[PDB]
Design a protein around this ligand. Structure first.
Ligand SMILES: [Ca+2]
Ligand SMILES: [Pb+2]
Ligand SMILES: [Pb+2]
Ligand SMILES: [Pb+2]
Ligand SMILES: [Pb+2]
Ligand SMILES: [Pb+2]
Ligand SMILES: [Pb+2]
Ligand SMILES: [Pb+2]
Ligand SMILES: [Pb+2]
Length: 141
């Protein structure tokens, strides 16, 4: 929509120091260093390349818009998976145990045994710690 675009155009403007309608490796360098980040010229060219679809060596507003729109979908998606994880994790210690899973399953209408739930933890527990971490949760969804 019109309103959504004018929001991304402000962020775009922040990068485009010169107001010429593109973001350059050096301009992106200036912003990233405002945020306390290094970065090398090599790393900078890579960030540009990942967004510069026409391949003329800078980023234009349409490329910026297309990128930001996919990031916008990744952000929301990440924050929804994160919220579900926090609900399964009762003590908020960063790990979902068997008792926590069984307790949530029970509320979801599924009365499982500890054997059954220990099997579900084992199914997602890649690292074998005995409980489910965040990436495993994201991967298991
Ligand atoms: Ca993505
Ligand atoms: Pb604003
Ligand atoms: Pb510029
Ligand atoms: Pb072009
Ligand atoms: Pb273009
Ligand atoms: Pb371009
Ligand atoms: Pb926990
Ligand atoms: Pb158990
Ligand atoms: Pb694990």
């Amino acid at each position: 929509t019109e309103e959504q675009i004018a929001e991304f155009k402000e962020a775009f403007s922040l990068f485009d120091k010169d107001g010429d309608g593109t973001i350059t490796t050096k301009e992106l360098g200036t912003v990233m260093r405002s945020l306390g980040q290094n970065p090398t010229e090599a790393e900078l060219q890579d960030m540009i390349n990942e967004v510069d679809a026409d391949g003329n060596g800078t980023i234009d507003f349409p490329e910026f818009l297309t990128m930001m729109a996919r990031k916008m979908k990744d952000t929301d998606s990440e924050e929804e998976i994160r919220e579900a994880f926090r609900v399964f994790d009762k003590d908020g210690n960063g790990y979902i145990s068997a008792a926590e899973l069984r307790h949530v399953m029970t509320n979801l209408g599924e009365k499982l045994t500890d054997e059954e739930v220990d099997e579900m933890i084992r199914e997602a527990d890649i690292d074998g710690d005995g409980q489910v971490n965040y990436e495993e949760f994201v991967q298991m969804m």
